[PDB]
Amino acid sequence: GLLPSTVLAIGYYENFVSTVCDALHSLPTIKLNGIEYKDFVFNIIIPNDLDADIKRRAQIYFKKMDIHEVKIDTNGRSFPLYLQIDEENSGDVAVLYDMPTTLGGIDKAIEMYMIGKTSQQQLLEERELRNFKTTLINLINNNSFTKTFVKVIEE
Amino acid sequence: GELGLLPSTVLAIGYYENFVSTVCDALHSLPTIKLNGIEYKDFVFNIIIPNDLDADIKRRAQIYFKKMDIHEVKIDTNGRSFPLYLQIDEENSGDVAVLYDMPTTLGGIDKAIEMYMKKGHIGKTSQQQLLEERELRNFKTTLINLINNNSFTKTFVKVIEE
Ligand SMILES: Nc1ncnc2c1ncn2[C@@H]1O[C@@H]2COP(=O)(O)O[C@H]3[C@@H](O)[C@H](n4cnc5c(N)ncnc54)O[C@@H]3COP(=O)(O)O[C@H]2[C@H]1O
């Protein structure tokens, strides 16, 4: 019984999480926005609901938390990926953030196969956010190039 | 019935919302479209939908781009949210830039169905390959309906076969 949240989590893991960790794992020395790091953590922000659109929401979170854009050029044919870095207090570890824009799909999808967000629809979009977070945590913990390097957190 | 919203439906929406209309919006915005230094008078954006999920999507796409002699191109330029990487036919594009992409999102259906299979087999079962089949068809139908229901994509994006 495949939940959409489950496919989306796997899509985001294979095509974004792994791709980013690999890019950073392939640099002899990690150098982000021209400062050298000895290690990294990659924080996946799960939103608490789908009331605000994810791109709008993420932008608010990153401004609020004063963390700024950084492009990581992938070690494949030079394709930079987009994410946010918290460059604070001369830390050795590069503390990176993303909020999965793929979650947008769930809001639009739910609101398209249904005015006012019913507690029934709220409990449905709640269930998907948790299923996505749970799948994602499982996938991360199941590969040595992602485990210890990736954190799934709440907004 | 509990919402029978297929995964392929949500993935097709996400691809449309966060990629197809992001690309069109970047090209519609350009006073003149300039790709790898070339001016184009308009564009068409072709979404290659794979016939199956036998081959991994990125392996597949490489094969299609290489067999079509299509080339890498960077769009959205700079300081426009984030840059995008596409494939263009520099050989047969005149006034119209012909752009390609194979949805990498389709890659999540394979690995998902492969996870949820309750046993290991040499290759794949007929039933397994039936689910893949009908999920790719739903994605194409969902994308074609999304594309056609908007001025900003309707003439500009086309779903093609591998
Ligand atoms: N370059 C990138 N920049 C930022 N986040 C990235 C990313 N590549 C992947 N992700 C994240 O991973 C999700 C799944 O990516 P996937 O490649 O499987 O599926 C993607 C992919 O097929 C396409 N797409 C989106 N952004 C793309 C990009 N910059 N280049 C190429 N394809 C992109 O649209 C699908 C849905 O994207 P969506 O945002 O809904 O959801 C994306 C997004 O949340």
Residue numbers in the entry:
A (entry chain B): 154 to 267, 272 to 312
B (entry chain A): 151 to 312
Q: How did the manuscript describe this experimental structure?
A:
To reveal the molecular mechanism underlying cAA recognition by ElSTING, we determined the 2.57 Å and 2.55 Å crystal structures of ligand-free and cAA-bound form of ElSTING, respectively, which forms canonical V-shaped dimer conformations. Binding of cAA stabilizes the formation of the β-strand lid and further induces complete lid closure to seal the ligand-binding pocket of ElSTING. This results in formation of a more compact dimeric architecture than cGG-bound bacterial STINGs. In particular, the hydrophobic sidechain of Y165, F169, and L234, a lid residue P233 along with phosphate-backbone-interacting residues N168, T254, and T255 together constitute a more compact and limited ligand-binding pocket to clamp cAA inside. In contrast to the cGG binding mode, there is no room leaving for cation-π or π-π interactions between the sidechain of R230/F232 and the bound cAA. As a result, the bound cAA formed a self-stacked, triangle-shaped conformation in which the two adenine bases came close to each other by inward rotation of 26° and shortened the distance between the 6-NH2 group of the adenine bases to 3.3 Å in comparison with 5.4 − 6.7 Å of the U-type cAA bound in eukaryotic STINGs. The base recognition of cAA by ElSTING was mediated via indirect hydrogen bonding through water molecules: w1 and w2 bridges the side-chains of the D251 and N3 atoms of the adenine base, whereas w3 mediates the hydrogen bonding between the main-chain of N168 and the N7 atom of the adenine base. Binding of cAA induced lid closure of ElSTING, which further oligomerizes into spiral-shaped filaments via lateral dimer-dimer interactions with a rotation of 30° per dimer along the direction of filament extension.
A recent groundbreaking study discovered the ancient origins of the cGAS-STING pathway in bacteria, which play a similar role in the immune system to combat bacteriophage infections. Binding of cGG to bacterial STING causes it to oligomerize into long filaments and activates the nicotinamide adenine dinucleotide (NAD)+ cleavage activity of its fused N-terminal Toll/interleukin-1 receptor (TIR) domain. Depletion of the electron carrier NAD+ eventually leads to bacterial growth arrest or cell death, restricting the replication of invading phages in infected bacteria, a strategy called “abortive infection.
